[PDB]
Write a protein that binds this ligand. Sequence first.
Ligand SMILES: CCCCCCCCCCCCCCCCCC(=O)OC[C@H](COP(=O)(O)O)OC(=O)CCCCCCCCCCCCCCCCC
Ligand SMILES: CC(C)CCC[C@@H](C)[C@H]1CC[C@H]2[C@@H]3CC=C4C[C@@H](OC(=O)CCC(=O)O)CC[C@]4(C)[C@H]3CC[C@]12C
Ligand SMILES: CC(C)CCC[C@@H](C)[C@H]1CC[C@H]2[C@@H]3CC=C4C[C@@H](OC(=O)CCC(=O)O)CC[C@]4(C)[C@H]3CC[C@]12C
Ligand SMILES: CC(C)CCC[C@@H](C)[C@H]1CC[C@H]2[C@@H]3CC=C4C[C@@H](OC(=O)CCC(=O)O)CC[C@]4(C)[C@H]3CC[C@]12C
Ligand SMILES: CC(C)CCC[C@@H](C)[C@H]1CC[C@H]2[C@@H]3CC=C4C[C@@H](OC(=O)CCC(=O)O)CC[C@]4(C)[C@H]3CC[C@]12C
Ligand SMILES: CC(C)CCC[C@@H](C)[C@H]1CC[C@H]2[C@@H]3CC=C4C[C@@H](OC(=O)CCC(=O)O)CC[C@]4(C)[C@H]3CC[C@]12C
Ligand SMILES: CC(C)CCC[C@@H](C)[C@H]1CC[C@H]2[C@@H]3CC=C4C[C@@H](OC(=O)CCC(=O)O)CC[C@]4(C)[C@H]3CC[C@]12C
Lengths: 380, 380
Amino acid sequence: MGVSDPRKIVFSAKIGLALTIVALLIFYQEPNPDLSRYSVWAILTVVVVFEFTIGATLSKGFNRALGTLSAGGLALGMAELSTLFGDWEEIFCTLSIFCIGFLATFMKLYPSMKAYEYGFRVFLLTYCYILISGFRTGQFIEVAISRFLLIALGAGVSLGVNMFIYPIWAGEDLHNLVVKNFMNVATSLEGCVNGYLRCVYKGYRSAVESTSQEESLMSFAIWEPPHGPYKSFNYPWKNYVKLSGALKHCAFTVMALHGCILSEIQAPEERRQVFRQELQRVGVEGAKLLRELGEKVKKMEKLGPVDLLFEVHLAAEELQHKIDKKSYLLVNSECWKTYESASALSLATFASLLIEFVARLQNVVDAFKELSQKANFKEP
Amino acid sequence: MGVSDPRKIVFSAKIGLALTIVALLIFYQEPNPDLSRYSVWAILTVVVVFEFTIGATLSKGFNRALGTLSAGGLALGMAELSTLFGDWEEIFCTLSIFCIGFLATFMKLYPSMKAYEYGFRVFLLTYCYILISGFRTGQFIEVAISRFLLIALGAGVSLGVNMFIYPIWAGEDLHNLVVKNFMNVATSLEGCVNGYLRCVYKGYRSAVESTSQEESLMSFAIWEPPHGPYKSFNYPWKNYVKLSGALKHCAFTVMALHGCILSEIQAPEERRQVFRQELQRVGVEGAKLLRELGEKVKKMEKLGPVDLLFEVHLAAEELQHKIDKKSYLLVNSECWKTYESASALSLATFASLLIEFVARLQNVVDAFKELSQKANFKEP
Ligand SMILES: CCCCCCCCCCCCCCCCCC(=O)OC[C@H](COP(=O)(O)O)OC(=O)CCCCCCCCCCCCCCCCC
Ligand SMILES: CC(C)CCC[C@@H](C)[C@H]1CC[C@H]2[C@@H]3CC=C4C[C@@H](OC(=O)CCC(=O)O)CC[C@]4(C)[C@H]3CC[C@]12C
Ligand SMILES: CC(C)CCC[C@@H](C)[C@H]1CC[C@H]2[C@@H]3CC=C4C[C@@H](OC(=O)CCC(=O)O)CC[C@]4(C)[C@H]3CC[C@]12C
Ligand SMILES: CC(C)CCC[C@@H](C)[C@H]1CC[C@H]2[C@@H]3CC=C4C[C@@H](OC(=O)CCC(=O)O)CC[C@]4(C)[C@H]3CC[C@]12C
Ligand SMILES: CC(C)CCC[C@@H](C)[C@H]1CC[C@H]2[C@@H]3CC=C4C[C@@H](OC(=O)CCC(=O)O)CC[C@]4(C)[C@H]3CC[C@]12C
Ligand SMILES: CC(C)CCC[C@@H](C)[C@H]1CC[C@H]2[C@@H]3CC=C4C[C@@H](OC(=O)CCC(=O)O)CC[C@]4(C)[C@H]3CC[C@]12C
Ligand SMILES: CC(C)CCC[C@@H](C)[C@H]1CC[C@H]2[C@@H]3CC=C4C[C@@H](OC(=O)CCC(=O)O)CC[C@]4(C)[C@H]3CC[C@]12C
C-alpha cells in the first residue's frame, strides 16, 4: 500500500503538482472572461495525458497526435464535400451518420484493429458535430482555435512534469521482473520437494502469466532514450525476453511436479521415504543454480571460467543410479486390486518429472550466455 | 469477421440506428440557437452508454448514476463551504486541488478500489472547474440544467435501443462457453494420444483461462430478468461455474499429457507400440463421455438410469492389467548409461497421467447431477 511500491506514492503526487501548476497559471492571467470558462479542457488534458512510464507516454502521445490531426482534417473536408451534392443533401446526411457509426463500432470489436480505433472515434465525433450543429468551415475553425490553446497548455505541462521529476523507466521493470521470476521458481522448486517428502504456487503461477507483461514492457522500452547503466541506441531487450521464455519451459515442469501432490492416487509414505536423501540434493542444487543465475543477471556479470551445471548433473546421475538399484519397489514383478498396483508408479512419475526438470536447464544457461554477449556484461 | 460472430454485425447497426434517431430528433426541433450547439453531449452519451450485454449495461448505468449524483452533490457543497473560511481562502484553494488530485490518482492504481474510482474522478473534475471558473451556486446550476437535457435524451435513447431490439444475454454466453469447453477438452484428449502413438493445445489452453470470463459473465447475468428457457428469480449460475471449475482440474491432466510429448528424454517407438491398443480405447472412451456430458448440458437433460462411468473404468482396469503383465520393459531389473535407463520410464509416466485423468472424472459427474437438480432439468 505504502511500502509495497513507493513509486505509487510519487506518481500521484506528480499528478497533483501538475494540476496545481495549471491552476496557478490560470490564476496569473488577467480577469479574462473567456480564459476561465474554457478551463475544463486543460484539466481534462492534464488528467488524460499522464502515463506511468516514459515510453508508454511517448507512444500514446505520438499515436494520439497523428490520429487527431488526420481525423480532424478528414472530418473537416468531408463536411465540405457534402454541401455540393445538390438536392440529395438530406438523405446523404442521414446515411453517412449511420455508416460512420457502423464503421466505428465495427473497428472497436476486433483486437487486431486497435491502432486505428482512436482516429475513427475522433472522425465520428467531429463529423456528427459539424453536421448537427449547422456550422461552416469558418465558424468551426474559430472554436477549435479558441479551445485548443487551453489543451496545449495542459499537454505541455503534463509532458514537462513527467520527463524531469523522478522519471520512471520500463527496462528496469523488465529487469526486476526477470529477477523475481528466477527467484519465484527457485522458491517453488524447494517447496514441491518438501511437500512431497513431508509425508509452492506463487513461483510457478507468476512466471507463466508474465509473457504479455514482458512483451508490453519491451514495447514501451523501445521508445526510450539511453540512460544510466543502459547506454546504447539499440539495446537488446528481446534477449531479456528470451531468457524468461526459456525459464517458463522449466516452470511448466515445476507446475507438473506440484500437481502430482494433488491427485486421488497417492503412494505410501514408507515407499517414498527411501529416496528422500537423493531427492533433497537435487531439490537444493536446482534452487542454488537458479538463484546464482538470478543474482548474476541482477549484477550484470558474465559467467565464470568454471562449469555451472555440474553439481545438479551429478545429483541427477546419483538419483538415476538409486532408482535403478531400487526399482523392485515400484512395479509388481510376480506377474510377468488395481489401485494398489497403480499407487506405486507415482514415485516413478515424480522422479521422471524431476529428471526432466534437471535436463531442461541447459537452454537457460545458453540464453544467459547469449544475452551477456549482446549486452556487454562486465567480466567477473 | 462476418460469419464467426453474427452478433458483432447487429450490435454495430444498433449503435448507428441510435445515432440516426438522435440526429432526427435534433432536426425535428425548431431553429433553436441553443439546442444545436450543445449537441456534442448527446452524441457523447449515446456512444458512451452502449454495452454488449443487458446485465453489464444495467450495472454500469446504476453505478454511474449513483456515483455521478453523489460526486455532484458533494462537489457543489465543498465549493460553498470554502467561501466562509475567511482570509485563508487562497492557500486552501491551492492545497485542496493538490490533495484531491493525489487522492484521485491513488484510488486508481489499486484494483481493489475500483467501484469508487468514477465518483472520485467526477468529484475532482467538478470541484476543480467550479474553483477555477469563478462560478457561484446559482451560476453553475443553470449550466448544469441547460446541458443535462441533451444528456438525458441520449441516455434514454441508448437505453431504449438496446433492451428491445435483439437483446443479447449473458447466460446464453456462459452456457455456450461451457459446451465449447467440454468439446475442446474432448478434442484435445484424442490428439494427445494420437500424438504420442503416431511414432492439441486449443482445448486445454482455452478451458484454464476461462475462469475470469465465467465470473464476469455470472456477475453480468445476476442483473437480468427472467426470459426464455431460464424462468426464475433466483437462477443458479454458480452451479454452471462449478462444473467448469471441475472440468479445469482434468484439463490440467490433459495439459501434463501434452507436455509429456515435448521433452528432451523420449522413449523408443518399439517400446511404446506395445500399449497402443490399450491406450486407444481409453483415449476414445474419455472423449465419448465428455461429448455425451456436453450434449446433455446443451439440451438440458437429466442423466439416464444407466451408469455413465463404466466403459472408461473398464478400459482403465484393462490398461492397468496390461501394464502389470508387461512391466519388465520399463525398468532395469538386472541390478537389484543413465539416459538409456531414464528413457524407459516415460511410458510409465504417461500411463500414470492417463490413469489420473481417468480417475478425476467422478467430480464432473457429481457437479452435473447437482446442477440438474437445482436447475430443474427435464427428464430424459
Ligand atoms: C472523463 C469523464 C468524467 C465524468 C464526466 C461526467 C459525465 C458527463 C456525461 C457525458 C459523457 C462524457 C464523458 C464520457 C467519456 C467517454 C469515455 C471514453 O471512452 O473515454 C476514454 C477514457 C475513459 O475510459 P476508462 O478509463 O476505462 O474509464 O477517458 C474518458 O473518460 C474521456 C476521455 C476524453 C478526454 C479527452 C479531452 C482532451 C481534449 C481533446 C479531445 C479530443 C478527442 C475527443 C474524443 C475523446 C473520446 C473519449
Ligand atoms: C502539430 C504539432 C507539431 C504540435 C501539436 C501537437 C498536438 C496536436 C498533440 C500532441 C499531444 C497530443 C495529445 C496527446 C494525448 C491526448 C490524450 C488523448 O487521450 C484519449 O485519447 C482519451 C483516453 C484514452 O484514449 O486512453 C486525447 C487527445 C490528446 C490530449 C492529444 C491532443 C493532441 C496533442 C496535444
Ligand atoms: C471513414 C472514411 C469515409 C474516411 C477515412 C477514415 C480515417 C479517419 C482513417 C483512415 C486511415 C486512418 C489512419 C491510418 C494510419 C494511421 C497511422 C497509425 O500509425 C500507427 O499505427 C502509430 C504507431 C502505433 O501506435 O502502432 C496511427 C493512426 C492513423 C493516422 C489512422 C487514423 C484514422 C484514419 C485517418
Ligand atoms: C487541421 C486541424 C483542424 C486538426 C486538429 C483539430 C482538432 C484540434 C479538433 C478536432 C475536434 C475538435 C474539438 C471538437 C469538439 C469540441 C467540443 C466543443 O464543445 C462545445 O460544444 C462547446 C460549447 C459547450 O460545450 O457548451 C468545443 C470545441 C472542441 C473541444 C474542439 C477542439 C478542437 C478539436 C479537438
Ligand atoms: C435522478 C434519476 C431518478 C433519473 C436520472 C438518472 C441519470 C442522472 C443517470 C442515469 C444513467 C446515467 C448515465 C449512465 C452512464 C453514463 C456513461 C458514463 O460513462 C463513463 O463514465 C465514461 C466511460 C467509462 O467510464 O467506461 C458517463 C456518465 C453517464 C452518461 C451517466 C449520467 C447520469 C445518468 C444519465
Ligand atoms: C474527497 C473527500 C473530501 C469527499 C468524499 C469523496 C466522495 C466523492 C466519495 C466518498 C464515498 C464515495 C461513494 C461510496 C459508495 C458508493 C456506492 C457504490 O456502490 C456500489 O459499489 C455500486 C454497485 C457496484 O458496482 O459494485 C457506488 C459509488 C459510491 C456512491 C461512491 C462515490 C464517491 C464517494 C461519494
Ligand atoms: C444534484 C446534482 C447537482 C447532481 C448531478 C450533477 C451533474 C449533472 C453534473 C456534474 C458535472 C456537471 C457537468 C460539469 C462540466 C460540464 C462541462 C461544461 O463545459 C463547458 O465548459 C461549457 C463551455 C465550453 O465548453 O466552451 C458544461 C456543463 C457540464 C457538462 C456539466 C453538466 C452537469 C454535470 C454532469
